[PDB]
Design a protein around this nucleic acid. Structure first.
Lengths: 66, 69
DNA sequence: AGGATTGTGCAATATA
DNA sequence: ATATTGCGCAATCCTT
């Protein structure tokens, strides 16, 4: 129907639940996007650390010549 | 009005656009989830390499430390 | 008995 | 003009 009070209450409650469900789905989607940004920055940091450790190892091993 | 031909054409075109837009958004979310798996595998590879090189550097520094002046 | 999910479409808004 | 976004609805699924 469209007039009964049981119907109006059911719609009011469902509209709350539908919005809650859609907000939750949107939040999960955004969280996945953020995770990509976080991992990309972290992999960039770790790669720079690899390069730094390699430079320190090379510098140390050069001491064997002198 | 809401029964005119112009209204019907606008809504039919928009409904097509809505499905196209939401399909693409769902596909992007699928690609993003795949990217997380790929970046996680790369992260684990990098963590292993950093740990290996850190140990290699620590042992070599300790070797030089045991050298007499 | 009542919330959570979802295919669908109206509507407002953003964008080109 | 199309693209994006929020929402209502009703059917449906799941909880209590």
């Amino acid at each position: 129907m469209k007039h009964s009070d049981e119907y109006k209450i059911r719609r009011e409650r469902n509209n709350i639940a539908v919005r809650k469900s859609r907000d939750k789905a949107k939040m999960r989607n955004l969280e996945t996007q953020h995770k990509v940004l976080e991992l990309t920055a972290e992999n960039e940091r770790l790669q720079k650390k690899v390069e730094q450790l390699s430079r320190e190892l090379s510098t140390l091993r050069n001491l064997f010549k002198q």
